[PDB]
C-alpha cells in the first residue's frame, strides 16, 4: 500500500519548518513534497535543452 510507510515526520532534533506543497510534473501529475515556503503548488517546466 502507498500509505504503508508514507506517514512520517522529520526525525531530527534541528531542522527548518516545511509545508505541504504539490509538485506538478511535466505531464500534469502531482506528488506531495515538503517545501521551505508555504507555496500552494510547484510546477516543473520543460527544459529547452532536451528539445
Amino acid at each position: 500500500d502507498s500509505s504503508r510507510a508514507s506517514l512520517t515526520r522529520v526525525h531530527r532534533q534541528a531542522y527548518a519548518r516545511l509545508y505541504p506543497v504539490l509538485l506538478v510534473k511535466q505531464d500534469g501529475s502531482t506528488i506531495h513534497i515538503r517545501y521551505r515556503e508555504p507555496r500552494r503548488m510547484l510546477a516543473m517546466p520543460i527544459d529547452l535543452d532536451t528539445l
Binding site: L22, D27, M44
Partner: protein
C-alpha cells in the same frame, strides 16, 4: 549555529498532551495490523510458489530445473513511483532551463 533563527517554545496544554499520548497508542495497533497483513501476504506467496515447484518437478524435472535458475534480465529492475494525480493528456509546461549543482 546562530541562535537568532530559533523560535520561542510554547508550552503544550494538558489536553493537547492527552490527545497526543492516546493517538500514539492507537498508532501502535494500526501499524501492527498493517504488518500482520503484510506478514500473511508474503506467507501466501511463499507457500504457493514452493508447492507449485513440487508439482512441476514430478511432471517434468527439466522444466523444474529451469524455473529455479536466476534471471539476468531481471536486473537492473526499475519501478516508477506513483503520483497523487494522473498525468494530463494535454498539458504544455512552460519553457525553462535546468542547471545542476554538485
Amino acid at each position: 549555529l546562530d541562535k537568532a533563527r530559533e523560535r520561542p517554545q510554547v508550552e503544550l496544554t494538558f489536553e493537547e498532551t492527552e490527545r497526543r499520548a492516546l493517538l500514539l497508542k492507537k498508532w501502535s495497533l494500526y501499524k501492527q495490523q498493517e504488518r500482520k497483513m503484510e506478514r500473511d501476504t508474503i506467507r501466501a506467496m511463499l507457500e504457493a510458489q514452493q508447492e507449485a515447484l513440487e508439482e512441476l518437478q514430478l511432471e517434468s524435472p527439466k522444466l523444474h530445473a529451469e524455473a529455479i535458475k536466476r534471471d539476468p534480465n531481471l536486473f537492473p529492475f526499475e519501478k516508477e513511483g506513483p503520483h497523487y494525480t494522473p498525468p494530463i493528456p494535454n498539458y504544455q509546461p512552460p519553457e525553462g532551463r535546468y542547471n545542476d549543482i554538485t
